[PDB]
Design a protein around this ligand. Structure first.
Ligand SMILES: N[C@@H]1[C@@H](O)[C@H](O[C@@H]2O[C@H](CO)[C@@H](O[C@@H]3O[C@H](CO)[C@@H](O)[C@H](O)[C@H]3N)[C@H](O)[C@H]2N)[C@@H](CO)O[C@H]1O
Length: 225
């Protein structure tokens, strides 16, 4: 059966709908840009990372948003006990408080963790760490994911390198992603709202998805969007 949908928001021409019923959820069909932030090889001096350095800002003391900075405004460089020594520490809005601000281990590794981005000022009740079910209507592929990063308020439809892989979307931070509105994201706001191990949040996403009616329901719903 088709679901009953109620508009709650709109960003960049994409309508965001509350899905009537329980558990509480919202859904949107959008493109999928790559967010490599949090990957410990995303950014390095002299374009050494998997993204161009300037995608994180200016790494010579100017405005740098890709990750934490030192007392003089330069990006923190990874140490010998970090995954990519000498690369910059790239940050995500969601974080693990077990690690310090200057540690790559504090952030969500885009290479390994399926995560979605929501636009700033458009979380629609979701809190970082909440879970989601993500579906690619062109490949038939799906994955559970967390709300792991915050994007520009004027853009919607973006997620991690690993989520791209799971959806069979080109995962390259420089030329990957898609502008085609082929990804359906079902967010469960209020579902977690904290950092926890991937095994735990993935199990919780699985339990909510079962209770909500499974992928079969989301597949039918996707035809309405
Ligand atoms: N490349 C830009 C960039 O703006 C954006 O990157 C993310 O921007 C977030 C802004 O909210 C930022 O969140 C902050 O992260 C730190 C560390 O946890 C916190 O202290 C702050 O409270 C957060 N506001 C992310 O770290 C950052 N990855 C990118 C995302 O795709 O899209 C472009 O706009």
């Amino acid at each position: 059966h088709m679901s009953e949908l109620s508009e709650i928001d709109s960003v960049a021409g994409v309508t965001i709908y509350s899905v009537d019923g329980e558990p509480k959820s919202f859904v949107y069909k959008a493109g999928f840009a790559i967010d490599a932030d949090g990957a410990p090889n995303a950014y390095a001096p002299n374009n050494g990372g998997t993204d161009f350095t300037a995608n994180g800002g200016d790494d010579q003391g100017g405005d740098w948003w890709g990750g934490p900075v030192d007392a003089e405004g330069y990006p923190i460089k990874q140490k010998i006990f970090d995954p990519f020594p000498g690369y910059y520490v790239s940050a995500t809005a969601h974080f693990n408080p077990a690690y310090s601000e200057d540690s790559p281990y504090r952030y969500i590794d885009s290479n390994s963790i399926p995560f979605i981005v929501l636009p700033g000022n458009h979380s629609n009740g979701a809190k970082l760490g909440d879970v989601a079910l993500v579906y690619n209507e062109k490949t038939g592929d799906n994955c559970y994911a967390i709300y792991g990063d915050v994007g520009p308020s004027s853009k919607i439809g973006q997620g991690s390198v690993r989520l791209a892989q799971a959806l069979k979307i080109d995962d390259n931070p420089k030329a990957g992603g898609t502008e085609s509105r082929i990804v359906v994201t079902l967010v469960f706001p209020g579902s977690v709202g904290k950092w926890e191990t991937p095994k735990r949040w993935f199990s919780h996403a699985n339990q909510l998805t079962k209770a909500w009616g499974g992928l079969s329901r989301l597949k039918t719903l996707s035809d309405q969007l």
